Design a protein around this ligand. Structure first.
Ligand SMILES: [K+]
Lengths: 127, 121
């Protein structure tokens, strides 16, 4: 069904980040990130009507990272469901990029938070 | 004491049932998110039509309990704990700034497509 195109669209960005992280390895934290993402890939083959979209990351007055939220993209209809999946994965890759760069600069549970939040927004459980 | 994520998901609409029957609708929006903490702006609506405004700081403590601090435009503060009762309902228990205590059942609004009633027990 239409669900399938979404599942495929998931594994797409998944392998995108497989590529980026593997080329950047030249790094054990990078490998644990890679582990967790391929760990979640095997559950792909769900559609949530309400999707949280982050604009980016802002560091507070101290060494506390924050994920700034744009809005929740409530897709009324089906084509909007696909199109919110699109905007969502695009902003998610965006924040992921800023996140890797920040973690190598500043050198915290932020990354596993990011990963498990993807797991949550897709499969529906904390794990 | 309940996993933090239980508060982000779903539609950002709820209803606060007070101890006496007063129902006040909550239209809220999460601005910032951390592994430990959460920030959100909240807009209440009384049954007569009065609105309010708040900024609420949610966080999980050391022992895993959910605690919150709410800031209002009346110079009034609120502080308390949030215990999840089911997937759509969590019970706030706490103390206002002048000292008066309270208990509030914050339920979330479920869409028409499905089972509205949610015991989930
Ligand atoms: K609002």
């Amino acid at each position: 069904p239409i669900q399938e195109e979404i599942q495929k669209k998931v594994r797409e960005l998944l392998e995108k980040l497989i590529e980026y992280l593997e080329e950047l390895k030249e790094k054990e934290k990078l490998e644990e990130v890679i582990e967790g993402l391929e760990r979640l890939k095997e559950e792909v083959d769900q559609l949530n009507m309400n999707l949280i979209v982050f604009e980016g990351l802002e560091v507070d007055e101290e060494g506390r990272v924050w994920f700034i939220v744009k809005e929740m993209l409530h897709a009324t209809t089906e084509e909007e469901a696909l199109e919110n999946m699109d905007k969502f994965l695009e902003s998610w890759e965006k924040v992921f990029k800023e996140l890797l760069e920040y973690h190598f600069e500043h050198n915290s549970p932020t990354f596993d938070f990011f990963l498990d939040f993807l797991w949550w927004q897709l499969y529906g459980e904390p794990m | 004491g309940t996993p933090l994520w239980a508060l982000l998901g779903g539609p950002w609409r709820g209803t606060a049932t007070y101890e006496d029957g007063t129902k006040v609708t909550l239209d809220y929006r999460y601005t910032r998110v951390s592994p430990d903490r959460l920030r959100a702006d909240v807009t209440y609506t009384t049954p007569d039509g009065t609105t309010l405004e708040a900024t609420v700081d949610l966080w999980k403590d050391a022992n895993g309990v959910i605690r919150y601090h709410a800031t209002y435009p009346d110079g009034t503060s609120a502080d308390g704990t949030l215990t999840q009762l089911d997937a759509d309902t969590l019970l706030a228990t706490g103390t206002y700034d002048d000292g008066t205590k309270y208990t509030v059942t914050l339920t979330r609004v479920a869409p028409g497509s499905g089972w509205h009633h949610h015991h989930h027990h």
